[PDB]
Design a protein around this ligand. Structure first.
Ligand code: HEC
Ligand code: HEC
Ligand code: HEC
Ligand code: HEC
Lengths: 254, 235, 190
């Protein structure tokens, strides 16, 4: 022990533990080795290694799975939905891709919610065909009648009621006559008469069954008043994957 | 990255297809100006490098220039026992026998052959009869590109050699994209052969000797620890 | 010894402790890669700058990273791996340390403003399983932008290239969405 006490405490003069010494030295040696091996070298990466490994990771991945994607690309979207080889792998992975990228807006189920379309069902705003769906995906995605003097506070109510009749039958006589007249004038141009709707515009059919969209009179009043304005963001930048996804979405209904 | 070769390390005994490609390149391109006197032709059959068929060697030899004689002045048929020819002057260059050691060596040749781009935006006119290289460092530089104290602002300098190859100068019999980069690598390896043919034997000797001497040294360490035991036991 | 000497011990400690800081921090000031902005990039617009401050005030950083690592899977999930140049303007830097929620670095258009509004208003509503807190107040409070000029001026002093013109020219939910929409956009378009 050593001669000096610090309130109670005294200290033994003992040797550093051999193992402790070894580990310390080993770490140092490893460090020098690491530095020589890293930036200051290691073989396998030409030039100098860096985060450059990223390129390698992607590249090997590309070599490994390029064929699967490339095979799919040649095939038409409709074919890529049908075929369980590509087509089935396209639904599960396309379905895989779907969960990562699309599920947050269109639901894990792809059923959708208020403000987002149900991809599973039969009804398509932009058109159900393969080309249409693909386009929706690749390049991405309602006029405010409250203001247009004529529409006003009353005109909107009437049009709302009339549309609910096109969709089904509620009972409000004033909200019907007026609305029919207005729809024929304005709405019909995009939604058609009897509300078939026009896919070109992405104008949905008014003659629909109970969907997730705000069917209620009030909600219809709001969409008519203020108008719509919904976006489907383009996956061309973010996203081959777009194609598989189109195949998956197409496969979803049927 | 750095495009390391095969021999760059403790192993790598001179992948021979690469050397045959470099030979296709050297005899059809570089031989027009360069030579390799320090290289016998028969070495194209010795192991380690291109283990070509001797008969083809004799044919290729007889198909070269005429090396006259040493005893009776008379243009002979140039037997393999002689050396590669020599291009000396009047628009010709040095000997490439050991150029892979007079400079990490082959990387110099690769990154030299690689790089003859147009003149930069300091002297686009350039020079008449001289062409530009981004890696040669022993060439002239115009005064427009030098700094205030004579040092050049360019990466390389102006070399008297023209660009040796275009996009697809020659065909490979084995089947391979004969772009400029692959040809450069191949010819670099061929020159390294021409300079260090006994590389693989070097490495194998090094391995054998390291092993035997490690063994001897271990045994001597045991003998020492033993002999010096009764004198290093109480402390 | 130096055990006995208070000044010596203090001095050596100060010296010993300093080397790492000098070695790591100082050279960064000098290195261009970390200094250079992406070529296309401009400073945050006044609304986006205000929104960024809101993002700071709320504590979004505590759940959301803004740094994409150079791995294939994160590239796949998030997008291009973050570059130093992207963060050049960021006083202070937003890189995360934790991802309770997903990485925000490159939401350079991924979601619509409407989605962002609904989600911020109530994350559970859009994403039922979300852990994220509801931030409805963002809708409730308006921005006065009294301070925005001062903020930009200070940032300019700090090196951000705001024009005099930019300062002069300059709801909270709106600002937050505006901020979120810019993230990672600079690289993609450039
Ligand atoms: C939130 C920003 C969404 C993202 C993420 C995804 N989708 Fe989307 N999509 C969204 C909306 C609000 C709409 C309706 C737009 C409108 O007309 O108002 C859509 C539409 C589609 C469609 C068209 C459906 C149709 O009826 O024709 C498709 C095919 C579609 N979305 C596909 C899709 C895919 C595959 C996605 C992941 C890559 C995806 N969407 C993401 C909102 C959002
Ligand atoms: C004449 C048309 C040439 C042919 C074809 C090739 N080379 Fe050459 N080379 C030539 C000259 C006149 C010079 C001297 C350049 C100078 O400025 O002094 C050279 C030089 C070289 C060198 C040496 C470079 C150095 O650093 O000194 C090398 C390594 C070299 N050349 C390689 C080379 C190869 C591989 C060729 C065939 C692909 C080749 N050269 C052809 C003239 C000519
Ligand atoms: C031209 C473009 C028009 C005009 C003249 C009208 N509508 Fe609208 N409408 C249009 C589009 C492209 C969409 C889809 C909006 C989106 O998805 O973001 C709509 C939507 C509606 C809806 C909502 C359907 C739903 O709940 O999902 C309604 C109720 C609707 N439109 C009604 C409506 C009425 C009553 C109109 C005349 C006053 C009218 N639209 C005109 C495109 C267009
Ligand atoms: C801790 C809990 C937080 C808090 C403090 C913040 N968020 Fe997030 N966030 C969190 C989770 C678990 C998720 C995933 C579930 C979901 O999407 O709701 C998110 C998600 C987001 C997103 C969407 C990211 C994406 O899917 O690409 C955004 C844009 C987002 N959060 C923004 C955001 C803002 C602005 C925050 C401060 C107000 C904020 N978050 C805080 C978890 C948490």
């Amino acid at each position: 022990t050593t001669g000096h006490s610090w309130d109670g405490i005294e200290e033994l003069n003992t040797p550093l533990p051999r193992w402790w010494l070894w580990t310390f030295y080993a770490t140092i040696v490893w460090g020098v080795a690491y530095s020589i091996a890293m930036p200051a070298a290691t073989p396998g990466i030409l030039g100098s290694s860096t985060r450059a490994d990223v390129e390698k990771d992607i590249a090997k991945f590309a070599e490994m799975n390029k064929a699967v994607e490339d095979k799919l690309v040649a095939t038409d979207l409709t074919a890529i939905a049908a075929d369980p080889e590509l087509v089935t792998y396209t639904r599960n992975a396309g379905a895989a891709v779907f969960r990562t990228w699309c599920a947050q807006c269109h639901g894990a189920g792809a059923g959708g919610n208020t403000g987002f379309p149900s991809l599973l069902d039969g009804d398509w705003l932009h058109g159900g065909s393969i080309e249409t769906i693909y386009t929706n995906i690749k390049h991405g995605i309602m006029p405010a009648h409250l203001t247009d003097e004529l529409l006003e506070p009353a005109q909107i109510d009437d049009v709302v009621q009339y549309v609910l009749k096109i969709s089904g039958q509620p009972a409000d006589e004033a909200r019907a006559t007026a609305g029919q007249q207005v729809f024929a004038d304005n709405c019909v141009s995009c939604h058609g008469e009897d509300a078939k709707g026009m896919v070109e515009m992405g104008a949905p059919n008014l003659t629909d069954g109970i969907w997730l969209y705000g069917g209620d009179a009030n909600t219809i009043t709001t969409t008519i008043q203020l108008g719509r304005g919904g976006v489907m963001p383009s996956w061309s930048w973010a996203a081959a994957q777009i194609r598989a996804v189109a195949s998956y979405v197409h496969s979803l209904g049927g | 990255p750095d495009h390391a070769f095969s021999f760059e390390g403790i192993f790598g005994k001179y992948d021979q297809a690469q050397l045959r490609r470099g030979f296709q390149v050297y005899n059809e391109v570089c031989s027009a100006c360069h030579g390799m006197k320090f290289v016998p032709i028969r070495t194209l059959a010795d192991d380690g490098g291109p283990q070509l068929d001797p008969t083809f060697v004799r044919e290729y030899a007889a198909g070269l220039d005429t090396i006259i004689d040493k005893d009776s002045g008379e243009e002979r048929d140039r037997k393999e026992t002689d050396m590669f020819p020599t291009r000396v002057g009047d628009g010709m260059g040095p000997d490439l026998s050991v150029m892979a050691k007079a400079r990490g060596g082959p990387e110099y040749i690769y990154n030299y052959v690689i790089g003859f781009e147009e003149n930069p935006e300091c002297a686009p006119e350039g020079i008449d009869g001289y062409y530009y290289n981004k890696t040669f460092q022993i060439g002239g530089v115009p005064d427009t590109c030098k700094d205030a104290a004579g040092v050049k602002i360019t990466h390389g300098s102006w070399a008297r050699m023209p660009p040796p190859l275009v996009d697809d100068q020659v065909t490979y019999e084995d089947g391979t994209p004969a772009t400029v980069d692959q040809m450069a690598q191949d010819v670099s390896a061929f020159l390294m052969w021409a300079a260090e043919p006994k590389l693989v034997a070097r490495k194998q000797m090094g391995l054998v000797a390291m092993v035997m001497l490690g063994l001897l040294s271990v045994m001597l360490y045991l003998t020492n620890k033993r002999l010096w035991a009764p004198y290093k036991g109480h402390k | 010894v130096l055990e006995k000497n208070a000044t010596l011990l203090l001095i050596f400690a100060f010296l010993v402790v300093t080397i790492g800081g000098i070695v790591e921090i100082a050279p960064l000031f000098y290195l261009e890669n970390t200094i250079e902005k992406v070529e296309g990039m401009r400073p945050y617009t006044p609304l986006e700058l205000t929104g960024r401050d809101i993002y700071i005030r709320e504590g979004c950083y505590v759940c959301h990273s803004q740094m994409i690592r150079p791995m294939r899977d994160e590239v796949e999930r998030y997008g291009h791996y973050s570059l130093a140049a992207e963060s050049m303007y960021d006083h202070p830097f937003q890189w995360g340390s934790k991802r309770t929620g997903p990485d925000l670095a490159r939401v350079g258009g991924r979601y619509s403003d409407a989605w962002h509004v609904e989600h911020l208003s109530n994350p559970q509503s859009v994403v039922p399983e979300s852990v994220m807190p509801s931030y409805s107040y963002l809708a409730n409070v308006p921005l006065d932008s009294t301070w925005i000029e001062d903020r930009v001026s200070t940032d300019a002093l700090v090196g951000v290239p705001y024009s005099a013109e930019m300062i002069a020219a300059a709801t909270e939910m709106d600002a937050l969405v505006a901020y979120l929409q810019v993230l990672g956009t600079m690289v993609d378009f450039s």
